[PDB]
Design a protein around this ligand. Structure first.
Ligand SMILES: [Mg+2]
Ligand SMILES: [Mg+2]
Ligand SMILES: [Mg+2]
Ligand SMILES: [Mg+2]
Ligand SMILES: [Mg+2]
Ligand SMILES: [Mg+2]
Ligand SMILES: [Mg+2]
Ligand SMILES: [Mg+2]
Ligand SMILES: [Mg+2]
Ligand SMILES: [Mg+2]
Ligand SMILES: [Mg+2]
Ligand SMILES: [Mg+2]
Ligand SMILES: [Mg+2]
Ligand SMILES: [Mg+2]
Ligand SMILES: [Mg+2]
Ligand SMILES: [Mg+2]
Ligand SMILES: [Mg+2]
Ligand SMILES: [Mg+2]
Ligand SMILES: [Mg+2]
Ligand SMILES: [Mg+2]
Ligand SMILES: [Mg+2]
Ligand SMILES: [Mg+2]
Ligand SMILES: [Mg+2]
Ligand SMILES: [Mg+2]
Ligand SMILES: [Mg+2]
Ligand SMILES: [Mg+2]
Ligand SMILES: [Mg+2]
Ligand SMILES: [Mg+2]
Ligand SMILES: [Mg+2]
Ligand SMILES: [Mg+2]
Ligand SMILES: [Mg+2]
Ligand SMILES: [Mg+2]
Ligand SMILES: [Mg+2]
Ligand SMILES: [Mg+2]
Ligand SMILES: [Mg+2]
Ligand SMILES: [Mg+2]
Lengths: 144, 129, 151, 155
RNA sequence: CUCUAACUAUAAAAAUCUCUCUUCUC
RNA sequence: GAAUCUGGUCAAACUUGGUCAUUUAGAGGAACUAAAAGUCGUAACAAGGUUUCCGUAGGUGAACCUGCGGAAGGAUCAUUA
RNA sequence: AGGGGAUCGAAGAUGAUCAGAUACCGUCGUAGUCUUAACCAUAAACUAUGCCGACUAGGGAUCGGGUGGUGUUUUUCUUAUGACCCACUCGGCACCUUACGAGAAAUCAAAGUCUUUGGGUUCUGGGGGGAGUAUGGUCGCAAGGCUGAAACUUAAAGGAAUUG
RNA sequence: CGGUAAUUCCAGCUCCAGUAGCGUAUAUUAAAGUUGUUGCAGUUAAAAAGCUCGUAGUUGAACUUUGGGUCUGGUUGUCCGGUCCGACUUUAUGUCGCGCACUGGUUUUCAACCGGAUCUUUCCUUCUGGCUAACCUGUACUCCUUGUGGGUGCAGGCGAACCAGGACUUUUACUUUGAAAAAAUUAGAGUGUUCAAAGCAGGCGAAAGCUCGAAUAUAUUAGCAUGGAAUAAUGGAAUAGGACG
RNA sequence: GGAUAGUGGCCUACCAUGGUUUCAACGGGUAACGGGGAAUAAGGGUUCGAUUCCGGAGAGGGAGCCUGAGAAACGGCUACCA
């Protein structure tokens, strides 16, 4: 049994077996192929700046019905365009179309989350300052 | 093609012991089997066995005294250092109190404690407990 | 019960008895047996045939037990061993028979299957008898050296 | 080797700064300086009475042996006056507790004082940089045949 | 501790569905 | 003994076209996801109302059907009645 | 490409049934069905169980073979056969009980001797889709095969098994 | 979760975990026996190339000196001799006790377990020379109680106690030990940085100079010497082209 | 033979046909300077090591250079491309 060779000089087949079968795992494939750098506009690094181009409201999945307020953003370090959702009650008025926004991932490792379609990112800072502080009024947008 | 003769020998031993057969028939009957069995008996884990001649490799008839729970081989005779043997202990012996991983060294086929007190290490063969 | 060229698992064989010495009842002596053996060999008889004849027509159970030595090695002693062992020779002959069949008619593709199997057996024996210094390594085998040697 | 009258190419072959005296009333053909490498190696007979030059011979040539000594198997003899030795050994990859039969082939220099066949087992030694491939040099061939010392069957 | 026998033959069409999904502790 | 300068010499570099990698627009072309109160039928899950499914080949608004070979994942493990 | 050309029968021509049936039903009827040379390389090429090994549990029966019967009918007054019954076995397809184990169970005498983890062994798969797809090869006269992704997208898909 | 009673929304209040730190995102490890060498699954869930031959790789049958007899160095625990310790309190012993708290003979039978010498038909390579280590030596035989209690001595002659000119030489892998692995980190010696992170300092005087240090292992792969000959591979002597005299 | 501090197809000249490979060559890729190490932790192990220590490498991209023991140096030069 155990159809993997066992002999005392019998692991070229074994080492190459692992060496080839690693590609089964997707994480290994992503890490070795640099897919977080060529593809996936968000360049694998935790944050990136961008410019707001337009605002959209999009519905939820089936077991919910709540039109979240997302924003089309163009990432300055590539010019590539993508959606990003803005989590809070009073945030859409804070978008200020044609502004600089600091964006991070939406915390699902390159996948949609919950009841949001086609979105992958969070809106964590707006115009230098952080939108979270604006939400609880800890600082104010200078309105430059 | 019988590849590791002692492997088959102990496999039959374990099969019958689980079944409860007070005795076992081993076909190949090589030196290594024999020495493994004097180690087996000297530790007290087996009774009196017999060798048959055939002018071809003989035969073995081992009397089971129930004290055995398992034999077992490590068919890849992994190369072991003097320090490493203890790890084999913690990976094959049911506890550190007793149990004997059998290894063949230049001195010969011996229990691991025999090797340690001889301070000599060779290659691994199997285990008994 | 290996049986490469099929799924056979039969252990039908012959088991030698315990006594490597000659049986008590036997009357003939080794030298006479050897002379009978060599005369039989000069008839042009393959060693296995001669062993069978010794077993049947006489109380010659084992060549080695009686004369202290086996048939092929004795036949080497008097410088009369054939160039090819009887085994490889008979296999080559059967291969020639297969070849003549396949040249006679074509649609025996299953006979092509037997052909490849047999020639694989020849390749195995060729490697063996090249390693053990029986044939000189120069010897090869395709179709026609068989036609010359066997015929 | 140099094959049947070494004095073949466009230049003469003379062991440097050894003088063949025409003024000696001797007719002694030539003065062939020779020397034993050492380390328990015996200079073979054919080297002392030979006529070849082989500036890169360890015995009759200019090179001096020093450093590593190895054992290997002749793998290729086609190349002229040199040789290639395969070396097969085991490599312990630690991840699997196993050894690994890999080969490394190395070129060395053979004097005409030696007869070499493919597959011969040869002791080789270290020397000066001789060629971009050759940095070792043969000493002597132990297994001259392997199994072929007896070939006939005439009892 | 003595038994081996009987047996039958329809087929006509039927297509579909947007709901709420809810909770278990001495 | 400088200038100039015979030769070669390493050769950066320039033109010229070939040749390749990568980005890169791109008339137009062909798909997939999520969106589930769009439309037509109802293919399937039971014998899904013609057993399914597979390979092959033609046709067929769509599903699919068809012919030939298969397999039970079938609805038969079963006729010395 | 060539010989055949009955029957059957994909295309098709057709008459039913139904709101729709160039579906199933029934007629005819090409390709094809037989095949000679040459391709074709796949099939649910599945026992969905790779091979070679040894060992473990009871039971009949069954095929090929051989062993021993004062075995029985055969009859060639007679043996010899054969053909049968008995007893044993070798090998082969399988089967019945069982759990002694082992499994997600359904079950399996191997799917066991596997955490008490190790007889030797080649090839495979790492959630579902996207997809056996794209792409580049490669084989091909072609139909097509072998090879073979990623982006993207989703929290289930799914296996056995439960009672309704 | 939310569709008019929200244990989740959003605030307020009660609180829970965290704490000068804590929360987010992107990568990573363990969890992961979800990469399975240790240690995966393959009748149905993912998956055994249709089957077969077959190069390379991988795997490979069993078989060739094992037992005693003796002697010893030991390292352990076995009686303890002495040294002496707790019951007895300011001080001490006979006595009871842990039946030696610190040291030996080991024939106390005991058991080992490591070698070492050895008799095995038992090689552990042996010569060519030192050097002779040494005493079968053997010369004066004697310092001496007949008595081997004890030795200078000088040609044969023990070499194995160590040296040295070769000649021999089956080789492996393996393994033990030693040599190398700078440092730094790791491990950990000691050391009151106020503790600790640390760091490699410090401690004692009487302050009159007197001292401790800066401990120790690890690294396995390549290489070198090394004790071992079980495991596994390899060579023989077949045309004797063989071994010795 | 030249040349080099000195070997060597280092370069030349005359020849010879060779060398490496499925035990992974060569090509492609490397968001790779290699290591000492770091993280992680039953054991086996996985990932990171631009970065205090070691080496090696560069001074915009290539080249060429005198001086000097030691330079192909760049806070030294000669030239082209930017
Ligand atoms: Mg319906
Ligand atoms: Mg010039
Ligand atoms: Mg409609
Ligand atoms: Mg329907
Ligand atoms: Mg119907
Ligand atoms: Mg259907
Ligand atoms: Mg036709
Ligand atoms: Mg018809
Ligand atoms: Mg109609
Ligand atoms: Mg219908
Ligand atoms: Mg029709
Ligand atoms: Mg019809
Ligand atoms: Mg298929
Ligand atoms: Mg069959
Ligand atoms: Mg997938
Ligand atoms: Mg799928
Ligand atoms: Mg293709
Ligand atoms: Mg409320
Ligand atoms: Mg809230
Ligand atoms: Mg798993
Ligand atoms: Mg499935
Ligand atoms: Mg399959
Ligand atoms: Mg198959
Ligand atoms: Mg092979
Ligand atoms: Mg063996
Ligand atoms: Mg270090
Ligand atoms: Mg520390
Ligand atoms: Mg490259
Ligand atoms: Mg790196
Ligand atoms: Mg670095
Ligand atoms: Mg550096
Ligand atoms: Mg200077
Ligand atoms: Mg420079
Ligand atoms: Mg510099
Ligand atoms: Mg500078
Ligand atoms: Mg300057």
């Amino acid at each position: 049994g155990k159809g993997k060779p066992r002999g005392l000089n019998s692991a070229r087949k074994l080492r190459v077996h692992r060496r080839n079968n690693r590609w089964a795992e997707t994480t290994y494939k992503k890490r070795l192929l640099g897919t977080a750098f060529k593809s996936s506009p968000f360049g694998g690094s935790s944050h990136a700046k961008g410019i707001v181009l337009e605002k959209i409201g999009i519905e939820s999945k089936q077991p919910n019905s709540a039109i979240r307020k997302c924003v089309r953003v163009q990432l300055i370090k590539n010019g590539k365009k993508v959606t990003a959702f803005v989590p809070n009650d009073g945030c859409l008025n804070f978008v200020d179309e044609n502004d600089e926004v600091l964006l991070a991932g939406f915390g699902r490792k390159g996948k949609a989350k919950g009841d949001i379609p086609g979105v992958r990112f969070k809106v964590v800072k707006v115009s230098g300052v952080s939108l979270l502080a604006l939400w609880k009024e800890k600082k104010e947008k200078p309105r430059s | 093609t019988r590849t590791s003769v002692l492997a088959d020998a102990l496999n039959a031993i374990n099969n019958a012991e689980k079944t409860g057969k007070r005795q076992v028939l081993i076909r190949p009957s090589s030196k290594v089997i024999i020495k493994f069995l004097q180690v087996m008996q000297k530790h007290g884990y087996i009774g009196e066995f017999e060798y048959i001649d055939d002018h071809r490799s003989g035969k073995i008839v081992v009397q089971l005294n129930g004290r055995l729970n398992k034999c077992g081989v490590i068919s890849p005779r992994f190369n072991v250092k003097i320090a490493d043997v203890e790890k084999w202990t913690a990976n094959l012996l049911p506890a550190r109190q007793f149990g004997y991983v059998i290894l063949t060294t230049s001195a010969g086929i011996m229990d691991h404690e025999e090797a340690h007190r001889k301070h000599v290490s060779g290659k691994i063969l199997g285990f008994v407990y | 019960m290996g049986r490469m060229h099929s799924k056979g698992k039969g252990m039908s064989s012959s088991a030698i008895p315990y006594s490597r010495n000659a049986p008590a009842w036997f009357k003939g002596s080794s030298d006479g047996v050897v002379e009978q053996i060599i005369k039989y060999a000069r008839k042009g008889l393959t060693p296995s045939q001669i062993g069978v004849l010794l077993r049947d027509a006489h109380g010659v159970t084992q060549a080695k037990v009686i004369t202290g030595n086996k048939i092929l090695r004795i036949l080497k002693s008097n410088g009369l061993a054939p160039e090819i062992p009887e085994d490889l020779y008979f296999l080559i002959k059967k291969a020639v028979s297969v070849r003549k069949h396949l040249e006679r008619n074509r649609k025996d593709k299953d006979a092509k299957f037997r052909l490849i199997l047999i020639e694989s057996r020849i390749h195995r024996l060729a490697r063996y008898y090249r390693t053990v210094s029986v044939l000189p390594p120069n010897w090869k085998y395709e179709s026609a050296t068989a036609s010359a040697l066997v015929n | 080797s140099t094959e049947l009258t070494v004095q073949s190419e466009r230049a003469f072959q003379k062991q440097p700064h050894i003088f063949t005296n025409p003024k000696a009333k001797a007719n002694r053909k030539t003065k062939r300086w020779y020397k034993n490498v050492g380390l328990g190696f015996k200079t073979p007979k054919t080297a002392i009475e030979g006529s070849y030059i082989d500036k890169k011979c360890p015995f009759t040539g200019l090179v001096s042996i020093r450093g590593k000594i190895l054992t290997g198997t002749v793998v290729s003899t086609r190349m002229h006056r040199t040789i290639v030795i395969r070396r097969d050994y085991l490599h312990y990859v630690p991840k699997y507790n196993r050894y690994e039969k890999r080969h490394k082939n190395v070129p060395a220099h053979v004097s005409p004082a030696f007869r070499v066949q493919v597959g011969d087992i040869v002791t080789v030694g270290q020397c000066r940089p001789i060629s971009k491939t050759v940095r070792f040099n043969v000493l002597k061939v132990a297994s001259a045949t392997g199994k072929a010392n007896k070939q006939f069957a005439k009892f």
